[PDB]
Design an enzyme around this catalytic site. Structure first.
Site, PDB file in Angstrom:
ATOM      1  N   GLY A  24      -2.445  -7.998  -0.501  1.00  0.00           N
ATOM      2  CA  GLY A  24      -2.129  -9.414  -0.441  1.00  0.00           C
ATOM      3  C   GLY A  24      -2.453 -10.099  -1.754  1.00  0.00           C
ATOM      4  N   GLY A  26      -5.231  -9.662  -5.567  1.00  0.00           N
ATOM      5  CA  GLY A  26      -6.572  -9.308  -6.003  1.00  0.00           C
ATOM      6  C   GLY A  26      -6.555  -8.446  -7.256  1.00  0.00           C
ATOM      7  CG  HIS A  28       2.918  -3.460  -3.644  1.00  0.00           C
ATOM      8  ND1 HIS A  28       4.195  -2.949  -3.751  1.00  0.00           N
ATOM      9  CD2 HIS A  28       3.049  -4.663  -3.038  1.00  0.00           C
ATOM     10  CE1 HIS A  28       5.057  -3.804  -3.233  1.00  0.00           C
ATOM     11  NE2 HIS A  28       4.386  -4.854  -2.792  1.00  0.00           N
ATOM     12  CG  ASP A  88       8.840  -4.221  -2.009  1.00  0.00           C
ATOM     13  OD1 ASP A  88       7.842  -4.462  -2.723  1.00  0.00           O
ATOM     14  OD2 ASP A  88       9.667  -5.097  -1.672  1.00  0.00           O
TER      15      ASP A  88
END
Length: 122
Positions: free
Chosen positions: A29, A31, A47, A89
């Site tokens: 998400g 970081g 990713h 993805d």
């Protein structure tokens, strides 16, 4: 975009990005501070590193097309950004699948301010 990414994730892992991966560990998400808590968290690190090589694109909002032939995710675009984001993805979807056996529910909502190591970069 988020639509296709989630579709891949769901198809590969059986889990929905929200809330299974949207805040997982230190890198899912978002970081930059680590270290990654486990293999799943490393998939997310990879990713974001992937998205980082896409400065001329909008990874979360640019749609793209893909199909599945002989079980494999096949990115159908030639259009630069669309094809690249899709490859990023596909990589994370499959990675999460490969490391699904170590997914830890205790890491699903790991506080980001508890990530105080170095920047992984990639």
């Amino acid at each position: 975009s988020v639509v296709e990414l989630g579709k891949m994730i769901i198809q590969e892992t059986g889990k929905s990005p929200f809330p299974s991966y949207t805040s997982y560990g230190c890198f899912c998400g978002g970081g930059e501070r680590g270290p990654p808590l486990d293999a799943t968290d490393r998939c997310c690190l990879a990713h974001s590193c992937c998205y980082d090589t896409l400065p001329d694109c909008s990874p979360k909002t640019d749609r793209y097309k893909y199909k599945r032939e002989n079980g494999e995710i096949i990115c159908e675009n030639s259009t630069s950004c669309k094809k690249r984001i899709c490859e990023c993805d596909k990589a994370v979807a499959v990675c999460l699948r490969k490391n699904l056996n170590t997914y830890n529910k205790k890491y699903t909502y790991y506080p980001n301010f508890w990530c105080k190591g170095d920047i992984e970069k990639c």
